Amino acid sequence: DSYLVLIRITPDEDGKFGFNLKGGVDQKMPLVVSRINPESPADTCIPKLNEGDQIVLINGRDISEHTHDQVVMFIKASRESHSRELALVIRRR
Amino acid sequence: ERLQRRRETQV
Ligand code: NA
């Protein structure tokens, strides 16, 4: 069955976390990690992000009715925080 | 009913 994982990523020097996103309310699909860049922040945090993970919470925010572009905005905005850390709750099988 | 090509974004 599915389970949740809390993933905390700090972006690299170029402001990148190292993963690709698909999905959003306008895409008729959940938010899904479509690619992990090997050895990037998303690939080397503990626990690490995985391809196929479904993102359900972004820095405490429920994203179930947000568009792809709105979600991308939320992720980039994590880089302006006090620590500039992205905290994802994802769902995995 | 219909489905456009889905966007993918690198972050
Ligand atoms: Na969504």
Residue numbers in the entry:
A (entry chain A): 5 to 97
B (entry chain B): 1 to 11
Which lines from the publication concern this structure?
PTPN3 is a multidomain protein of 913 amino acids comprising a N-terminal FERM domain that determines subcellular localization, a central PDZ domain involved in protein-protein interactions, a short linker of 30-residues and a C-terminal protein tyrosine phosphatase (PTP) domain able to dephosphorylate protein substrates. We solved the crystal structures of the complexes formed by PTPN3-PDZ with peptides comprising the PBMs of HPV 18 E6 (PBM-18E6) and of the cellular partner TACE (PBM-TACE). In all cases, the overall PDZ fold of PTPN3-PDZ is highly conserved, and the peptides bind in the conventional mode as an anti-parallel extension to the β2-strand.
The PDZ-mediated interaction of E6 with PTPN3 results in the proteasomal degradation of the phosphatase. We previously obtained KD values of 26 μM, 29 μM, 53 μM and 37 μM for PBM-p38γ, PBM-HBc, PBM-16E6 and PBM-18E6, respectively, using the same methodology. The PBM-18E6 valine at P0 (V0) is additionally bonded to the carbonyl of G519 on the α1-β1 loop and to the Nζ of K580 of the α2-helix through a molecule of water. In all our PTPN3-PDZ/peptide complexes and in the previously reported PTPN4-PDZ/peptide complexes, the E side chain at P-3 forms a bifurcated H-bond with the amide nitrogen of N524 and with the side chain hydroxyl of S538 in the β3 strand.
